[PDB]
């Protein structure tokens, strides 16, 4: 009765060293009702692009939509020219080719659009995919590795639908304040699927692909999750947890034990974020059912020491929301949903960094290349959750929202929590990003990003003094 977990195709290079991605409109079915949806190589979501460290691939991207889009590789340490930020326009009916020279450790990354002012809508319509980066090191570890059997991607997303079955997306005053969220949870595009897994260890590559909703994964029968990797790759050793908070755009890979004759659910637990604890999410909600079919590593990798903080450039990034949006938006939330919404209290340019709404034509600063910087990101004076994402890098978190990072969050990350307090990350950019293809740094609550909470930055030379 439960549908099976859809498994994205694991896509590798052809004999020409090319991967073809087609962006296009189609249809999907949710709870019996048809909806217009968009996908990469299909109707919804996308494949998993498989990349090998030290090898180049060329991706041909065909935009068969009737509007512009871009294709950003979230978590990839590549040059601005192929980063697919807002300046990476792919015309409707057109094609753009990018060569990815992969040079970072094994990791589960992802890809999605980054079209200026419309990223939230384009993701909500269905556009997201995965990146599986492998290297020599990870293959020696004997992790579960049968793609779609015991090594399974799990993209978790909410949507809401109107009466006619169609996806009901709006960038309005309420969503620009608290984000777009819905009442229906999807798992690789399916509602509450089941996955058949071999007895032993199941590897789940978890992605929060929601526009705005934070998630908190756990198991129905309280069996633990062993986190083996974060956004940017393997942790030094497994970290046992009973629950796992995952912000929008973050990935974690976990190992969970599968025992004969004991089905259980992966679930998501209620979170404190405004709007996100409305029914059906006021209680633990199922994500998928694991069905055992009657068919743990000590050390995973090495995590280098944090470099000395002395003499590193510090960049301050002050996040803000115009008081007018903050009160009107929160008022709309509370009036519609009431106390359950838990409101802890022109909009197109009302969300800001350092007093400025995103300017695509004027990068705010030029970072140094090949040098560690200390970026201090503040949400002081605003109660909203901002998962802050910096392009072109995998960084280390020094401080996360006023505390040292939890052990499973102390490795390689591209996202950091900012909520009412201040975070500090240690970041290095190995590749060029010029003014014409700048790197983005932004809140990954997509409606904030789309209404100004993003900056462009360049990377070019730095160390000549
Ligand atoms: Cu990104
Ligand atoms: Cu706010
Ligand atoms: Cu935000
Ligand atoms: Cu480079």
DSSP string covering 172-194, please?
SHHHHHH----SEEEETTBSS-E
Joined together, the tokens standing for residue 352 give: 């800001």
Strands (E), 188-284: 194-198, 200-208, 215-219, 225-230, 233-241, 244-246, 251-258, 264-268
The distance of Cα 168 from the centroid of its chain, to the nearest Å, equals 21
Give the domain range for residue 230: 146-295
> Do 158 and 130 lie in a common domain?
no
Number of continuous H segments (helices) and E segments (strands) in the chain: 5, 30
Give the end of a domain, one of 95, 128, 145.
145
User: How far is the centre of ligand 4, averaged over its atoms, from the C-alpha of 101 (Å)?
Assistant: 8
- Ligand 1 centroid to 332 CA: how many Å? 30
The phi and psi torsions of 237 (rounded to 5 degrees) equal -140, 165
**349 CA distance to ligand 2 middle (Å):** 13
Q: Ligand nearest 460 Cα, by number?
A: 4
The C-alpha atoms of residue 261 and residue 14 are separated, in whole angstroms, by 41
Which residues participate in the annotated binding site?
A: 72, 74, 112, 114, 386, 389, 391, 442-444, 448
Are residues 137 and 161 part of one domain?
A: no
Cited resolution, angstroms:
2.1
- Distance (Å, rounded) from C-alpha 123 to C-alpha 114? 9
Experimental method: X-ray
**Boundary-marking domain end, from 97, 122, 145:** 145
Question: Which numbered ligand comes closest to the C-alpha of 83?
Answer: 1
4: which DSSP letter?
B
* Interatomic CA distance for residues 388 and 210, integer angstroms: 15
User: What letter would DSSP give residue 243?
Assistant: -
- The reply to whether 122 and 150 lie within a common domain is no
- List residues, by chain if needed, whose CB lies under 5 Å from ion ligand 2: 321, 326, 382, 384
Of 156, 213, 128, nearest in space to 179 by CA: 213
Domains in the chain, number = 3
Which ligand is nearest the CA of 232, by number?
A: 1
d(CA 213, CA 207): 12
Q: Which ligand is nearest to the CA of 387?
A: 3
* 285 class by beta-carbon count within 10 Å (0-12 exposed, 13-18 middle, 19+ buried): middle
Contact yes or no for 192/2 (Cβ under 8 A): yes
* Residues of the binding site for Cu cation: 72, 74, 112, 114, 386, 389, 391, 442-444, 448
Question: 412 in a domain, yes or no?
Answer: yes
Distance of CA 82 from the midpoint of ligand 4 (Å): 10
Q: Quick one: tokens of 121?
A: 């809508």
Q: Are residues 165 and 116 in the same domain?
A: no
Same domain membership, residue 150 and residue 139 = no
Cβ-based neighbours of 305, under 8 Å, separated by 6 or more:
none
Q: Rounded to an integer, what distance in angstroms lies between the CA atom of residue 111 and that of residue 366?
A: 25
Tokens of residue 399, six digits: 């401080």
């Amino acid at each position: 009765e439960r549908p099976t977990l859809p498994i994205p195709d694991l896509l590798t290079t052809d004999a020409r060293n090319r991967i073809q991605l087609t962006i296009g409109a189609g249809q999907s079915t949710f709870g019996g009702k048809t909806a217009t949806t968009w996908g990469y190589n299909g109707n919804l979501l996308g494949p998993a692009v498989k990349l090998q460290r030290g090898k180049a691939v060329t991706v041909d991207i065909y935009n068969q939509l009737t509007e512009e889009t871009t294709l950003h590789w979230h978590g990839l340490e590549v040059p601005g020219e192929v980063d697919g930020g807002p300046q990476g326009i792919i015309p409707p009916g057109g094609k753009r080719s990018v060569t990815l020279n992969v040079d970072q450790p094994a990791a589960t990354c992802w890809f999605h659009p980054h079209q200026h002012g419309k990223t939230g809508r384009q993701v909500a319509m269905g556009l997201a995919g995965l990146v599986v980066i492998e290297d020599d090191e990870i293959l020696k570890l004997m992790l579960p590795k049968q793609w779609g059997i015991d090594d399974v991607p799990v993209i978790v997303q909410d949507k809401k639908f109107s009466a006619d079955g169609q996806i009901d997306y709006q960038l309005d005053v309420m969503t620009a304040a608290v984000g777009w969220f819905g009442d229906t949870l999807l798992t690789n595009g399916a509602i509450y699927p089941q996955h058949a897994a071999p007895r032993g260890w199941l590897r789940l590559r978890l992605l929060n692909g929601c526009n705005a909703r934070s998630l908190n994964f756990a198991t129905s029968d309280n069996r633990p999750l062993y986190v083996i990797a974060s956004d940017g790759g393997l942790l030094p050793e497994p970290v046992k947890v009973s629950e796992l908070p995952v912000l929008m755009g973050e990935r974690f890979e976990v190992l969970v034990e599968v025992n004969d004759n004991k089905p259980f659910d992966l679930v998501t637990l209620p979170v404190s974020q405004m709007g996100m604890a409305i029914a059906p999410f006021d209680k633990p909600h199922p994500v998928m059912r694991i069905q055992p079919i009657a068919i743990l590593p000590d050390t995973l990798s090495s995590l280098p020491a944090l470099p000395s903080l002395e003499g590193l450039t510090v960049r301050k990034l002050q996040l803000s929301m115009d008081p007018s949006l903050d009160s009107s938006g929160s008022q709309s939330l509370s009036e519609k949903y009431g106390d359950q919404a838990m409101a802890g209290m022109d909009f197109h340019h009302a969300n800001k960094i350092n007093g400025q709404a995103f300017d695509m034509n004027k990068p705010m600063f030029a970072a140094a290349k090949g040098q560690y910087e200390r970026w201090v990101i503040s949400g002081v004076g605003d109660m909203m959750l901002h998962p802050f994402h910096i392009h072109g890098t995998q960084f280390r978190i020094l401080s996360e929202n006023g505390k040292p990072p939890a052990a499973h969050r102390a490795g390689w990350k591209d996202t950091v929590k900012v909520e009412g307090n201040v975070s500090e990350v240690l970041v290095k950019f190995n590749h060029d990003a010029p003014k014409e293809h700048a790197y983005m740094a932004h809140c990954h609550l997509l409606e904030h990003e789309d209404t100004g909470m993003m900056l462009g930055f360049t990377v070019l030379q730095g160390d000549h003094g």
